[PDB]
């Protein structure tokens, strides 16, 4: 019986305007009559929760507590409470979550490093490191995008925030992508996008192909007519 309280990402909101907030309990016992109630800080309950979990195949039993709120309410930053009331421990545990206050806004500085030439000599796989830096608050979101088709996340892996050594407040993150070298040798640029609530239109992005990233070759051919 361990409960994860899952606040939606700012990204999830801003791409849905649907600020569902959930809390999951993991590896408890799936009896029936499993009961969890969402309440505000006031104690007053809120809208219910449907499509709740069932018994897991590997005994890591679960139960999703769905909820909803108005976005400004979360912006207002008041504590939210889903409490587990099941006979396993009919003692009501307290899952209280909020939004921190006082965090300033700071922007991602998305560089994008290209695969090391060495890795291009093992002759199969290539790796690209989308990077974000020096930003506040936490919880950036990223995905990778190329040729106008999205890249299903099982290609890429992303870090989570963790403070800069130098910046007292600003976090950072990563992302990693693995691709066949011939695919990267094909040209075939790649674009990593980031969405984060200090970014003007909320979304910036950068790209790289073989030619942009660390080229050995500079071929300008510039013509200047009619001086």
């Amino acid at each position: 019986i361990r409960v994860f309280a899952i606040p939606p990402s700012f990204a999830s909101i801003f791409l849905t305007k649907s600020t569902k907030l959930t809390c999951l309990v993991t590896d408890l016992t799936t009896y029936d009559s499993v009961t969890i109630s969402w309440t505000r800080q006031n104690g007053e309950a809120v809208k219910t929760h449907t499509n709740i979990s069932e018994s897991h195949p590997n005994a890591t039993f679960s139960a999703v507590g769905e909820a909803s709120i108005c976005e400004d309410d979360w912006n207002s930053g008041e504590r939210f409470t889903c409490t587990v009331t099941h006979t396993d421990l009919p003692s009501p545990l307290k899952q209280t979550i909020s939004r921190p206050k006082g965090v300033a806004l700071h922007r991602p500085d998305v560089y994008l490093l290209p695969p090391a030439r060495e890795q291009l000599n093992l002759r199969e796989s290539a790796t690209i490191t989308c990077l974000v830096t020096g930003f506040s608050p936490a919880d950036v979101f990223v995905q990778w995008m190329q040729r106008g088709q999205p890249l299903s996340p099982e290609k890429y892996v992303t870090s989570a925030p963790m403070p800069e050594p130098q910046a007292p407040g600003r976090y950072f993150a990563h992302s990693i992508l693995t691709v066949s070298e011939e695919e990267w040798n094909t040209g075939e640029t790649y674009t990593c996008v980031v969405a984060h609530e200090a970014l003007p239109n909320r979304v910036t992005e950068r790209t790289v192909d073989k030619s942009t990233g660390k080229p050995t070759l500079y071929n300008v051919s510039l013509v200047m007519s009619d001086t």
Binding site: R107, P150, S152, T189, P200, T212, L222, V223, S225
Partner: protein, 104 residues
């Protein structure tokens, strides 16, 4: 003291001019046309679609721009290319340069 004949902020060209009023001899002066270009060798050819090749040629028909396919991100007016995001698909905006697309 120079006289900016042209200042094209989306080609980073800047043709100035300056009469080098000589040592105070008679009017044996020669006027002087400084030029300056900062070619990027980083950008696309479709400046506003980062899914194209980079660039090789940089052609300056100065006649044409002594007065629209020009290839530097001008600092002040900013760009964007609507870009799909998936959380289900969604076809959504972007901000291809920061610090200038700030609706403020």
């Amino acid at each position: 003291e120079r006289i900016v004949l042209v200042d094209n902020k989306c080609k980073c060209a800047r043709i100035t001019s300056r009469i080098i009023r000589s040592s105070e001899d008679p009017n044996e002066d020669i006027v002087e046309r400084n030029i300056r270009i900062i070619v990027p060798l980083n950008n696309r050819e479709n400046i506003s679609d980062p899914t194209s090749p980079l660039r090789t040629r940089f052609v300056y028909h100065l006649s044409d721009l002594c007065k629209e396919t020009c290839y530097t991100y001008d600092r002040n007016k900013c760009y964007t290319a609507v870009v799909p995001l998936v959380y289900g698909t969604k076809m959504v905006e972007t901000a291809l340069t920061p610090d200038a697309c700030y609706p403020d």
